[PDB]
């Protein structure tokens, strides 16, 4: 095994790891691809998402060229810290952990012409800015922008090693999304300018879509049953004042306690979501029942069935159905 040891020592002899390959003669390009092993959960509260990757970088180094009986030197992690590596950082990452259990999860393969490869396991928590105007029937484009930190456009450029449609691969079993679903990857390459200089940035857009299964059991369906609960109060004895009264006061309490959960789930945005508009219209249709009963009680030989009750037995459910057929079509179907 001493034949390979002297090859590694000859590669590392007189090697300055502080300098990029070809500092004053060429641009050190870096070929990049991402193997997404698990698209983790999207936390709406922090406007962030977690992604576990196999970030691979490949670049040409002319100092690491060896002549030996083995073409590819699959070396250990140690070798990685002793050679030059690009300082790729995520522009919108918040807190990302490079896993090192049990050994550091890194890879380093030096081919005989000097071409390198550097795979890494990361768990990136990146910023995904959300516009919750169409909550919960919305779709986002959560980005992931990486790029160099110290080296500008004239020093280090980035590129995809395969075709850009096939340079970000998502594993089939790797979907830890329980609320959303992944509709497809999307990449782009651009140049960003800051106070120091112009940098090459590579953007990976992940398209998402919220599934309406949690809120159609937690918010929409209990509010519809709350409105229907108030709708049966028009089929009650005109004389039964405490009964219709209790129906109304409780419906109003269930309506106001049901809204709490909505704002409890999403972040404190200034505007109003579409679920909040549904809450408001359901509140209007449940609070008009008390106004109707108060009018009947103000307007209450035996008593007769009120004409207001006979009109409200028909008008209120058809107005609720018309509102549902407007709202659900307008938001879900477009």
């Amino acid at each position, epitope marked *: 095994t001493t034949v390979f040891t002297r090859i590694l020592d000859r590669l590392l002899d007189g090697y300055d790891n502080r300098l990029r390959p070809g500092l004053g003669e060429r641009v050190t390009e870096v070929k990049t691809d991402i193997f997404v092993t698990s698209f983790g959960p999207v936390s709406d509260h922090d406007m962030e998402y977690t992604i576990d990757v196999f970030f691979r970088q490949s670049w040409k180094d002319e100092r690491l060229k060896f002549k030996g009986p083995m073409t590819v030197l699959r070396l250990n992690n140690l070798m990685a810290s002793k050679i030059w590596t690009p300082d790729t950082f995520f522009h919108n990452g918040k807190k990302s952990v490079a896993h090192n259990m049990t050994m550091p999860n890194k890879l380093l393969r030096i081919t005989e012409d000097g071409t390198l490869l550097y795979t890494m396991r990361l768990t990136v928590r990146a910023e995904c800015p959300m516009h919750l105007e169409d909550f919960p029937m919305d779709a986002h484009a959560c980005p992931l922008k990486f790029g160099s930190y110290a080296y500008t456009r004239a020093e280090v450029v980035y*590129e995809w090693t395969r*075709e850009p449609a096939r340079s970000v691969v998502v594993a089939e079993d790797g979907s830890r999304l329980n609320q959303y679903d992944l509709l497809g990857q999307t990449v782009d390459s651009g140049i960003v300018q800051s106070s120091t200089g112009e940098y090459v940035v590579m953007t990976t857009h992940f398209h998402l879509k919220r599934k309406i299964g949690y809120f159609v059991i937690q918010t929409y369906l209990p509010c519809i049953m709350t409105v229907i609960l108030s709708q049966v109060s028009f089929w009650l004895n005109r004389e039964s004042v405490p009964a219709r009264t209790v129906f109304g006061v409780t419906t109003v309490l269930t309506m106001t306690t049901l809204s709490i959960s909505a704002r409890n789930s999403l972040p404190k945005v200034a505007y109003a979501t579409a679920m909040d508009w549904f809450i408001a219209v359901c509140y209007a249709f449940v609070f008009s029942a008390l106004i109707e009963f108060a009018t009947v009680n103000y307007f209450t030989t035996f008593n007769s069935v009120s004409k207001i009750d006979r009109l409200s037995r028909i008008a209120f459910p058809l107005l609720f159905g018309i509102f549902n057929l407007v709202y659900w079509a307008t938001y879900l179907n477009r």
Partner: antibody
Amino acid sequence: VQLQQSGAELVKPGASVKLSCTASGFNIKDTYMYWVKQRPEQGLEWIGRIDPANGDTKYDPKFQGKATITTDTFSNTAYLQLSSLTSEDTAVYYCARKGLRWAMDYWGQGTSVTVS
Amino acid sequence: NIVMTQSPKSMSMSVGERVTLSCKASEYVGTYVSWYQQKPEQSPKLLIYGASNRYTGVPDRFTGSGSATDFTLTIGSVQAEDLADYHCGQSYSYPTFGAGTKLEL
């Protein structure tokens, strides 16, 4: 920095022709090699892909089977194989080097094939 | 596949004014288009890469632009030696090409 191709060919239809272009000034192991078809008074049509470092090849679905791309390391050369030549295959071929941001940087002088 | 539908086939104007082109993509290609020129009896040469990046040796009069789907190439004060055919390509997927936009007097 210069891509030199072969000469013009004239063979009978139904035969096979060897077509080649030689790259100089660099190595083809770094960048991809792209083949393209230009029919006269028509647009360009991409033939296929080859990665000489890996040996992997990818082709258009309409050019699968009748065309394939081979390569070698020592001569630094890319090759074409054409089978079952017809009248619609009368065109001119270029080999294109993959450039910065996938842009088809360098082009050859062009080999015109003709059937009779 | 990715379909390039660049329009029109040819434009016939004089020397010294502004002429623009257009390249419409069927599916999303993100700033990965390329523009080439085609003289008669001449191999293509690269002009624009990315979306709007000027290649070395390209004059400043050739100004490109890019977006998610719509792409264009604007020529300012076209001269007599620029009378050639222009091709719009893409490389976000396996590469395709457009029909070809010519120029006339």
